[PDB]
């Protein structure tokens, strides 16, 4: 199916009112001018964007003869049967004019014949051209035939067939306003709890298509009936191998008895839980899992945290506020400094606190041995990020992916640098893509990469001060379990001079090992002759005399 | 061209070489000018090479094919050069057409003994397409690169890329035009925008630095709004002149050695 079953597309439905409805339903108007209005409409877009449902929705809204055709169904085993089946499709449409043909998945049979290394395949393409031309000529005046074709790979079509479609409609991924309309059309026959905020649901589904939104509704429905299965398991558990295995066995036993499920409404909490259970089709591959690191894991670094909130977390959460002042929805951050001071840690909190999509690149991970496959990976990297905006791209140890372009530089590694130059700031737009780079050698990064629009801001993450080492040590200790007065003394000790965040974590590890040695020796004495492993202040003394700083030349990275 | 500030000389050369003959082919044919141009835009990064190539592609009302660096390269034998040959076939059949090769040094490096054969066969293919036996009239080629000296010397000859236009750092009075252009398209008045752009802390700023300066000023506005809004709750943002003062302190030029790109 029905015109209400298709939603989120309004420009598309406006065109089809004069390119599909008018030729088929306004037949008399065309006959006044003596004009043969035989039209051909090609629908293309991402898979799941309601191309098949749009064709069937508008095929019941017109009422003319409709011929649904699937491309594999017109293939036969006989020598001439395959081409005869296609011929009968267009012959029946002329006999039933006005009529609407839907050639779904037309790219399966109408592929390029320069690469279709067969005889049937080339004659199938030629038969479609002849069929689409008989419609324009063999139909009576005033009885037009419209051919609808849907394919998510329009580039595979033969150019001699693609030119026969006067109208091409690109059904892209739904926008935020469009996703709200689709959700309403999917839940219009369900019983909702009157508190469903479709504005919030559309805002929390940045990279979803119509099929993905159907899964959210499908997942939310199962939430409502989840409580009606626990009540069913209670009737079976109390009637008479882990718990999940018992459920599959108790329900198997009562395979001849059924209990009516009470009708329930779907609340807003179920919908918000359903969104988390559904992964978008565009998120199936290429995306990393969100790190568990939060701001509670990051001690000190208040200056760094404030810069990352204004540059990334801010515009992601409320882009409306940042748009008014004139800030583009795209940031490029270069974190640099001595090793172990929290560059990767603070970039995993941003990936987690912003609640956006995350892709992490491990240095030169995109390099490939073939000529074009390393630059293609970079181009594909920004295609997935753009399609699932907002997204955070994190390049860990980025100096290995964008080395400074010199004569001595390899030609193959200079193409990757120039590929990233165009992806970050070129002709195409990367709005909604936020890039974070972490490196120890900011001077080994190409100077064109380090410019506003590609990586505008450089944030220096250096060695902690004496006051900062207290915040870091408390953060490390409380996230792994002495009190706090002793931690201040341990962190402020002159033996901790030059310690980084990784050294304080190593200092705590050396304190725990000293605790275990103390436990080992005392346990034997109080078991043979005659406990609780807890890090005492005496254990911290052993660690302070054992752990040495790791950044031995701080000024080598401070430059 | 309303998005482009300063660059008056660069606009004239692009209007005479590309925009001119596209709109009035008869006038340029009369004096004996071939209906095809090759232009190499070079200079330090962030100075507007891609910006003016996007203005030419839009103000000329011609067909546009954009090539983003070495995106034509394929791992199979002959497919990388087939894409280049197919690229010019499309441009010729839809003339007048503008081909923009962004970051062109990645597609036509100098033919050395260490360049391998896969990338040397693409340079030679681009040599024949730009000037060979075949006819490529009606195809206007623009290239942008930060490293003009790393391009093959055969490519940079009259017939393939005849003219090189240097898009360098803005002057003191050019930054005023660029800053006003950036601010006008993203809405302080105009007397204050002159003070910001003429400030000595803006020395060496490119076009991207002035855009970053305006973004830093905008971010400083939201910090001021947050502090005031919280105070009113406890006890329409506009980029004021005090925001530009602290934006001029936290923004540095992104071209450290401009002479290295000259």
């Amino acid at each position: 199916m029905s015109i209400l079953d298709i939603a989120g597309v309004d420009d598309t439905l406006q065109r089809l009112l004069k390119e599909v409805w008018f030729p088929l339903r306004g037949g008399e108007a065309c006959e006044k001018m003596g004009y043969r209005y035989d039209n051909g409409v090609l629908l293309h877009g991402p898979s799941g964007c309601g191309k098949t449902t749009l064709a069937h929705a508008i095929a019941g809204s017109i009422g003319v003869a409709f011929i649904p055709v699937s491309a594999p169904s017109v293939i036969g085993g006989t020598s001439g049967e395959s081409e005869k089946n296609i011929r009968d499709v267009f012959d029946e449409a002329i006999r039933l004019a006005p009529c609407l043909i839907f050639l779904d998945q037309i790219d399966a049979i109408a592929g390029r014949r320069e690469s279709a290394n067969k005889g049937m395949e080339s004659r199938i393409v030629a038969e479609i051209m002849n069929g689409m031309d008989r419609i324009r000529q063999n139909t009576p005046l005033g009885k037009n035939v419209v051919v609808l074709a849907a394919t998510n790979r329009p580039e595979f079509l033969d150019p001699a067939i693609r030119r026969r479609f006067s109208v091409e409609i690109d059904m892209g991924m739904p926008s935020e306003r469009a996703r709200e309309q689709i959700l309403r059309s999917l839940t219009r026959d369900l019983s909702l709890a009157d508190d469903i905020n479709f504005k919030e649901l559309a805002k929390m589904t940045p990279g979803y298509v119509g099929s993905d939104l159907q899964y959210v509704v499908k997942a939310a429905v199962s939430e409502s009936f989840q409580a009606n299965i626990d009540s069913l398991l209670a009737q079976a558990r109390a009637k008479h191998v882990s718990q999940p295995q018992r459920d599959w066995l108790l329900l198997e036993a009562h395979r001849d008895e059924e209990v009516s499920w009470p009708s329930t409404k779907i609340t807003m909490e179920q919908f918000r839980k359903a969104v988390s259970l559904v992964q978008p089709a565009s998120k199936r591959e290429g995306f990393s899992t969100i790190p568990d690191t939060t701001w509670s894991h990051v001690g000190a670094l208040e200056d760094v945290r404030k810069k990352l909130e204004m540059s990334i977390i801010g515009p992601i959460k409320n882009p409306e506020l940042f748009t008014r002042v004139g800030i583009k929805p795209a940031a490029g951050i270069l974190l640099w400094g001595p090793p172990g001071c929290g560059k990767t840690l603070v970039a995993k909190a941003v990936a987690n606190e912003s609640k956006a999509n995350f892709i992490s690149i491990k240095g030169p991970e995109l390099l490939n041995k073939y000529v074009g496959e390393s630059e293609r990976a970079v181009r594909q990297l920004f295609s997935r990020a753009k399609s699932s905006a907002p997204c955070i791209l994190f390049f860990d140890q980025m100096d290995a992916l964008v080395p400074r372009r010199d004569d001595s530089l390899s030609d193959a590694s200079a193409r990757v640098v120039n590929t990233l130059l165009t992806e970050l700031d070129g002709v195409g737009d990367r709005s909604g893509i936020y890039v974070i780079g972490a490196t120890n050698r900011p001077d080994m990064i190409d100077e064109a990469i380090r410019r506003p629009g590609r990586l505008g801001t450089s944030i220096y993450v250096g060695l902690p001060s004496a006051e900062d080492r207290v915040k870091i040590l408390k953060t490390l200790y409380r996230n792994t379990v002495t009190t706090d007065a002793d931690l201040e003394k341990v962190a402020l000790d002159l033996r901790c001079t030059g310690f980084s965040g990784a050294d304080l974590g190593n200092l705590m590890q050396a304190a725990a090992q000293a605790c275990l040695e103390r436990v080992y020796t005392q346990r034997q004495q109080k078991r043979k002759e005659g406990i609780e492993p807890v890090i005492t202040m005496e254990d911290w003394e052993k660690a302070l005399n054992e752990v040495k700083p790791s950044v031995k030349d701080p000024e080598k990275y401070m430059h | 061209w309303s998005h482009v500030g300063a660059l008056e000389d660069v606009r004239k050369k692009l209007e005479m070489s590309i925009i001119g003959p596209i709109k009035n082919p008869e006038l340029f044919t009369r004096v004996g000018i071939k209906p095809a141009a090759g232009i190499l835009l070079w200079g330090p990064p962030g100075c507007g090479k891609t910006l003016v190539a996007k203005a030419v592609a839009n103000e000329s009302k011609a067909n546009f094919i954009s090539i983003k660096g070495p995106e034509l390269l394929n791992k199979y034998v002959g497919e990388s050069e087939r894409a280049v040959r197919q690229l010019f076939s499309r441009a010729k059949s839809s003339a007048p057409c503008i081909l923009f090769f962004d970051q062109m040094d990645a597609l036509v490096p100098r033919r050395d003994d260490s360049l391998s054969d896969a990338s040397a066969r693409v340079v030679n293919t681009l040599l024949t397409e730009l000037d060979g036996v075949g006819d490529r009239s009606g195809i206007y080629v623009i290239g942008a690169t930060n490293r003009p000296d790393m391009i093959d010397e055969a490519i940079r000859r009259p017939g393939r890329l005849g003219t090189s236009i240097y898009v360098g750092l803005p002057s003191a009075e050019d930054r005023v035009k660029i800053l006003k252009t950036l601010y006008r398209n993203t809405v302080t008045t105009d007397a204050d925008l002159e003070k910001v752009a003429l400030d000595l802390r803006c020395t060496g700023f490119s076009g991207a630095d002035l855009g970053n300066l305006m973004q830093a000023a905008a971010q400083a506005c939201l910090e001021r709004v947050y502090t005031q809004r919280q105070q009113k709750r406890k006890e329409e943002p506009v980029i004021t002149m005090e925001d530009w003062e602290k934006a001029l302190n936290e923004v540095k030029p992104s071209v450290k050695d401009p002479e290295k790109y000259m």
């Binding site: 020598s79 | 199979y76 260490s114």
Partner: peptide, 24 residues
């Protein structure tokens, strides 16, 4: 007799380009 359309195989064997590395 009836003539039938049959599906078959191919040899193809495309050749791919490679990138190498050199010493100092």
């Amino acid at each position: 007799l009836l003539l039938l359309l049959l599906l078959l195989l191919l040899l193809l064997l495309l050749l791919l380009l490679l990138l190498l590395l050199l010493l100092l």
